[PDB]
Amino acid sequence: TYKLYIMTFQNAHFGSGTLDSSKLTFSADRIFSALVLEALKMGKLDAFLAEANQDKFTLTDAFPFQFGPFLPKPIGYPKDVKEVRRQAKLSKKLQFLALENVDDYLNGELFENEEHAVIDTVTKNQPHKDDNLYQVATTRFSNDTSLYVIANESDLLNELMSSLQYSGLGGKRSSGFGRFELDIQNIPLELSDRLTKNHSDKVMSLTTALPVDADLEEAMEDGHYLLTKSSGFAFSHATNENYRKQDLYKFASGSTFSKTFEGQIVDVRPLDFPHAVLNYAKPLFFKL
Amino acid sequence: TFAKIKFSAQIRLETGLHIGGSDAFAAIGAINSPVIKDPITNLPIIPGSSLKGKMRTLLAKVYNDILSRLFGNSKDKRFKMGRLIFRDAFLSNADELDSLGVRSYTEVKFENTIDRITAEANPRQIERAIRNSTFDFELIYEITDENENQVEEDFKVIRDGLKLLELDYLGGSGSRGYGKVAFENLKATTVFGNYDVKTLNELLT
Amino acid sequence: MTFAKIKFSAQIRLETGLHIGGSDAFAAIGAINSPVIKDPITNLPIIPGSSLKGK
Amino acid sequence: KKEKIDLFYGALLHNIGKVIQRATGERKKHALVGADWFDEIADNQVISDQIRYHMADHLAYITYIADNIASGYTNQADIFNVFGAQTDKRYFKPTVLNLKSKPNFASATYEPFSKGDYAAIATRIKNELAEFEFNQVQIDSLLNLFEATLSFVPSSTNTKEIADISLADHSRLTAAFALAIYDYLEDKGRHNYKEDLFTKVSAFYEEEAFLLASFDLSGIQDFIYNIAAKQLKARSLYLDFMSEYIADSLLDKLGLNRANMLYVGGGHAYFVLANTEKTVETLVQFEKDFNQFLLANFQTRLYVAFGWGSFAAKDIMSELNSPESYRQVYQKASRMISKKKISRYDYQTLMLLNRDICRGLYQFSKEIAHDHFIITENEGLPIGPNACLKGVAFEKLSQEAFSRVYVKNDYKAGTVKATHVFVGDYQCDEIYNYAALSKNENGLGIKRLAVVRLDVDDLGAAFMAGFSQQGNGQYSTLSRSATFSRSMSLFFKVYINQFASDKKLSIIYAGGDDVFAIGSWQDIIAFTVELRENFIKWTNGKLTLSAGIGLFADKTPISLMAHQTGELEEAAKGNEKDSISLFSSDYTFKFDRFITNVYDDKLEQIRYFFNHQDERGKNFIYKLIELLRNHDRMNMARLAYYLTRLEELTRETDRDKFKTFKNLFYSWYTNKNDKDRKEAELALLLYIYEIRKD
Ligand SMILES: Nc1ncnc2c1ncn2[C@@H]1O[C@H](COP(=O)(O)OP(=O)(O)OP(=O)(O)O)[C@@H](O)[C@H]1O
Ligand SMILES: Nc1ncnc2c1ncn2[C@@H]1O[C@H](COP(=O)(O)OP(=O)(O)OP(=O)(O)O)[C@@H](O)[C@H]1O
Numbered sequence A: 001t002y003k004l005y006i007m008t009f010q011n012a013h014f015g016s017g018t019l020d021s022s023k024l025t026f027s028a029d030r031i032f033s034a035l036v037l038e039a040l041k042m043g044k045l046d047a048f049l050a051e052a053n054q055d056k057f058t059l060t061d062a063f064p065f066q067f068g069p070f071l072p073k074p075i076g077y078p079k080d081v082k083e084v085r086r087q088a089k090l091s092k093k094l095q096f097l098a099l100e101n102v103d104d105y106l107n108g109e110l111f112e113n114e115e116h117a118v119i120d121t122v123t124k125n126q127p128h129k130d131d132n133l134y135q136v137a138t139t140r141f142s143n144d145t146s147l148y149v150i151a152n153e154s155d156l157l158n159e160l161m162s163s164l165q166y167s168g169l170g171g172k173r174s175s176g177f178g179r180f181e182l183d184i185q186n187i188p189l190e191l192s193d194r195l196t197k198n199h200s201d202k203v204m205s206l207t208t209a210l211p212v213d214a215d216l217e218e219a220m221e222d223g224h225y226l227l228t229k230s231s232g233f234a235f236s237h238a239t240n241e242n243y244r245k246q247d248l249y250k251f252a253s254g255s256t257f258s259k260t261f262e263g264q265i266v267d268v269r270p271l272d273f274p275h276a277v278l279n280y281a282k283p284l285f286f287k288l
Numbered sequence B: 001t002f003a004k005i006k007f008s009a010q011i012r013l014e015t016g017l018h019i020g021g022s023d024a025f026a027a028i029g030a031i032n033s034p035v036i037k038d039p040i041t042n043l044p045i046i047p048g049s050s051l052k053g054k055m056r057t058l059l060a061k062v063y064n065d066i067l068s069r070l071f072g073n074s075k076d077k078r079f080k081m082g083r084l085i086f087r088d089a090f091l092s093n094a095d096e097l098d099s100l101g102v103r104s105y106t107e108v109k110f111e112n113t114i115d116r117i118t119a120e121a122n123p124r125q126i127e128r129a130i131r132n133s134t135f136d137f138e139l140i141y142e143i144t145d146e147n148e149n150q151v152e153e154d155f156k157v158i159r160d161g162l163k164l165l166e167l168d169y170l171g172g173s174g175s176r177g178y179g180k181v182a183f184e185n186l187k188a189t190t191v192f193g194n195y196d197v198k199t200l201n202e203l204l205t
Numbered sequence C: 001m002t003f004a005k006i007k008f009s010a011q012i013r014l015e016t017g018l019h020i021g022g023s024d025a026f027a028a029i030g031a032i033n034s035p036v037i038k039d040p041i042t043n044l045p046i047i048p049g050s051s052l053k054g055k
Numbered sequence D: 001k002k003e004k005i006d007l008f009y010g011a012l013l014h015n016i017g018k019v020i021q022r023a024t025g026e027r028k029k030h031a032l033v034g035a036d037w038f039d040e041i042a043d044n045q046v047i048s049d050q051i052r053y054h055m056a057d058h059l060a061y062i063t064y065i066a067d068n069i070a071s072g073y074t075n076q077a078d079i080f081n082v083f084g085a086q087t088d089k090r091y092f093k094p095t096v097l098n099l100k101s102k103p104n105f106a107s108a109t110y111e112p113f114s115k116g117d118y119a120a121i122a123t124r125i126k127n128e129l130a131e132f133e134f135n136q137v138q139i140d141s142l143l144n145l146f147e148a149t150l151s152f153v154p155s156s157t158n159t160k161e162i163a164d165i166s167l168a169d170h171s172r173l174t175a176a177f178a179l180a181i182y183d184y185l186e187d188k189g190r191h192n193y194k195e196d197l198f199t200k201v202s203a204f205y206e207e208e209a210f211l212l213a214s215f216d217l218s219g220i221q222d223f224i225y226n227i228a229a230k231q232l233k234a235r236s237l238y239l240d241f242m243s244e245y246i247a248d249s250l251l252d253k254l255g256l257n258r259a260n261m262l263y264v265g266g267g268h269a270y271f272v273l274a275n276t277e278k279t280v281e282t283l284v285q286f287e288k289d290f291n292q293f294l295l296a297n298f299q300t301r302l303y304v305a306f307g308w309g310s311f312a313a314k315d316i317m318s319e320l321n322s323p324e325s326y327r328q329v330y331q332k333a334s335r336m337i338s339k340k341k342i343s344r345y346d347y348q349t350l351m352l353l354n355r356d357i358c359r360g361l362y363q364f365s366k367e368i369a370h371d372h373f374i375i376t377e378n379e380g381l382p383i384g385p386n387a388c389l390k391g392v393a394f395e396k397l398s399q400e401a402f403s404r405v406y407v408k409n410d411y412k413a414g415t416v417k418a419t420h421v422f423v424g425d426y427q428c429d430e431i432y433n434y435a436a437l438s439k440n441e442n443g444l445g446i447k448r449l450a451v452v453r454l455d456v457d458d459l460g461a462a463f464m465a466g467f468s469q470q471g472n473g474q475y476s477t478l479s480r481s482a483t484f485s486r487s488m489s490l491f492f493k494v495y496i497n498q499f500a501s502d503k504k505l506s507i508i509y510a511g512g513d514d515v516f517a518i519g520s521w522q523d524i525i526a527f528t529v530e531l532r533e534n535f536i537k538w539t540n541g542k543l544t545l546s547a548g549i550g551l552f553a554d555k556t557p558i559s560l561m562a563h564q565t566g567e568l569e570e571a572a573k574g575n576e577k578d579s580i581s582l583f584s585s586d587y588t589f590k591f592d593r594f595i596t597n598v599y600d601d602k603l604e605q606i607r608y609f610f611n612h613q614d615e616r617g618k619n620f621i622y623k624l625i626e627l628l629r630n631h632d633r634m635n636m637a638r639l640a641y642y643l644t645r646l647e648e649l650t651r652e653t654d655r656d657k658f659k660t661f662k663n664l665f666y667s668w669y670t671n672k673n674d675k676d677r678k679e680a681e682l683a684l685l686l687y688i689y690e691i692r693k694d
């Protein structure tokens, strides 16, 4: 709920399913699994997990900051022969909206995803294997675009988040992908009043969430949500191999529900696995 | 003990390098092999994977463990993502190449092939970053409690992996030039954590 | 410890001065019709290693 | 379901008189001579009773109302007359569908042929209509017999106001309505005499009956191309028989069929159901039944979103200001899909979730030379919640439900259950040998495959907001949109295959507006030139397409092929949307300008020069390209020296020939519009490609 965490990324890689596609942002899983891996490289793991399980802990997904903070497209709010069809192909590559324009967006104004990166791909190989010819996609930000995981400020969190900036964030680390720098900035008040956690009227989630089983029924019939795919492998130092995770589906950021809910941190431990592989799905919301 | 020491060397190309790029559509009178450049900065780079795999194999020709814990291993349980996070280089002297008049930072070298027994040439236009380009190199050795007096064995390897790469090519069509390279201004600050600097910066030269 | 790497230093002091062809571009209207390959930052003649390897 | 059989055929056959009328022309009425010709075949009474007294028995008033809801001496007018153009007739040559002949491109010189050649039509009708059992087993084999033969003949064809729609579709779209009128009147619960609601009063239009359903097989693009290479053809064809089995099992859970349908091309499919208290919950049930089928197999890579629009019979006409609400008929079902595409996968399909075909479909890849596709059960390649899909040989009659035969309409149209899926003919070679087959017998041409990815621009715009320029009580009928949707579906799913006659390529999915062709590079461009030039004749060019061709080597991955030409037609969707883009993000020529000013204007004259001289060659061509790429103002003068210097060097029996080349070359080099320069920059590429020796 507290201060923004602006991050100047400069050639990161945030894969989604494959290695051939970076996705210009990252879910709250990517930032929460990073901090736990930082807290395990330090000694301060269980000091973070008590704070991770704490009620006041907040995160959100990454959204492009270049001049002011930007927000995801509120899914399911458009509330004349060709342009109403032509702009549907253009307001579908429209996903990241300015905070000075969300109130204008729900009443009608055209936007185009003012360009943040060139999501290209590079070709790589391993020369003496005869079958390693791979491609790593790449998001490459436009020299002033930042992402700001909005989080509750703490001495432990700034101790770990300033360790990610010299240890990378995202995929293909140890190859020059994801290495950034921090700028913790105060949240503007015209964004800060709409941040909620237990509101009840026409709210928008802005992180990948997964409700409790009683609340999960409540978000279906009134929510204009969007699913995800939290597959992949589990990064461990006590396995000698690599196992898959348990592949849960979360509600992507921009899922405009009718009211808020409470979500958990889903444990996706593989079968017969030593430690606990978690997945942050606590929600964080936004009024309209 | 937790620290993150960072190298900041200056990659200087005594012979102009080529790093291949990617398969795109070349026209008739166009460059057959364009160098990989960041899309936004229309300038050459050296990708961090290109520095890693050349340093990985050159140290494999000497130290054959010591190599797996510096570069990572999907096997070898404790050596997944071992201790080094490299970074894509960038042009430092982009303002200092011009005033030594250079109109475009990448030269285009024309080559051919003489097919044997028919003697008919087969031309080629490969693009290379010019010589006195200076790239900024940042190698990051992360200190945790799982080191246990290995923070000097792991610097007669990196500083020797640089020295092997001094006298070998760096990326692209080596054995024909294109990699006579130099690492300049070696220094190792501690950008995050608490660790000394004198015991390894005096190991240099 | 049977890994070494040695270098043959030499000095190519030539005679009958050489034309390793370079940019076969469309030249100027009365200028040099076929220049040589050159270092960009000094505009001096070079002998490339690829012209030394295939030859 | 006994009365639904007899109500359906007579709805299709209430205007079977006018093909028996205008062939061997009598004078009397057409509704009577239909049943007169019909009573000689099988002597069925209730179907003939629907033909005798439907223009003036509680069965023929449904036909009389549905003949009006279709649309409420002269050859068939063209469907591309009523647009933003007001000088054309282009009446159809009234021949039949052939599948191995050229398309009858409708020209304005076909007005008089209104009496003569109809006897060739009615002769073929006797062949299949005679030995006909009139059950629901051969229920679609008669629907072949109207689309293959009764297509290009007109309906009433008098001095009326409609004058445009066919007789095949007018038979379908009336018989589509008449069963939906039956289910609306039956599920309401009153059958006490039709004249009382239909002919005694005309207030049947003022209630929302016979709603418009639709679905959308989403994820259809990312499934196919994310995979020694012809396995992708069976993957893109597997999702057509899935796209039809959705459209057929939805009509199996109802009492409807392929008449109750307006479109099935490529995932999207529209319908005309009955707005009952019964059809709205058999859609929710079948959507719930089919989406859990996609989870156990495809794990939310695919999703089907059944949306429906409850429209009224008044909102389909042309008299009132219903064209201003005619888009709302499609929009109400399109708003439901676009809302169901958002809120997917309800509660217990997700709480149950949070806790093969990959090898089996390889067997289907070897079943692509077969032409008879069977709906078996629990055998191989599942396509529905208890069914499967196999391509069997001529050794058929092994426990079939549907016999999905090939594109024929004529050869395999003698067996039982003629269910037709029109897909992808001329898969000439395997994909890894289109590069090596670019050299001719002379042995010159460059070894590169090339892949076409095109689509028609404002097809969904002209489908819905088309026919909308002529008055406030404008034409804009559903029948004028069903025949439009039939005309494009008959173009792509049939006529592309003859455009790929022997053009050394493999059509993958000539479907909705998309065509994804991949073949040898010379005949992949000769295909595209003979694609839209045939299409603008077909569409009276007012509704255009845009292609993107990418030239690749052999053994490049198709995911790299289909994306780098998929995002290369996106550069052609942004030029003016009517544009080819060749090999790169530039060379985005307007398509009509690409043929008359590059491919035939300049490239012939470049071919005409160097194949009718001796002393020039590739060195002269290469220095012209290098002066065409840069183009300084200095290179205008520097090229003026270079061309004048070569007059001096020729042998003076070719100097005036070269002088007609350089006065014509330097003409298009020095301009201000910057138009013909990059045209000749491209026209030299395709000439120097096709002359390269190994
Ligand atoms: N069987 C098929 N084979 C190949 N391509 C197909 C097939 N069916 C449909 N397509 C094409 O794939 C294209 C892309 O469809 P896509 O996967 O985006 O689903 P969609 O319904 O268009 O999703 P959205 O409506 O959200 O864009 C469609 O325009 C269609 O032309
Ligand atoms: N057989 C068909 N009958 C009616 N309409 C069709 C048919 N095939 C395709 N269409 C229309 O064409 C659309 C294909 O969408 P696609 O994204 O490929 O292009 P588009 O929406 O027509 O516009 P654009 O080409 O500018 O993207 C479908 O949404 C559909 O409405």
Ligand SMILES: [Mg+2]
Pocket (backbone or CB within 6 Å): D454, D455, D456, D513, D514
């Ligand atoms: Mg299209």
Ligand SMILES: [Mg+2]
Pocket (backbone or CB within 6 Å): D455, D456, D457, D458, D459, D460, D513
């Ligand atoms: Mg289109």
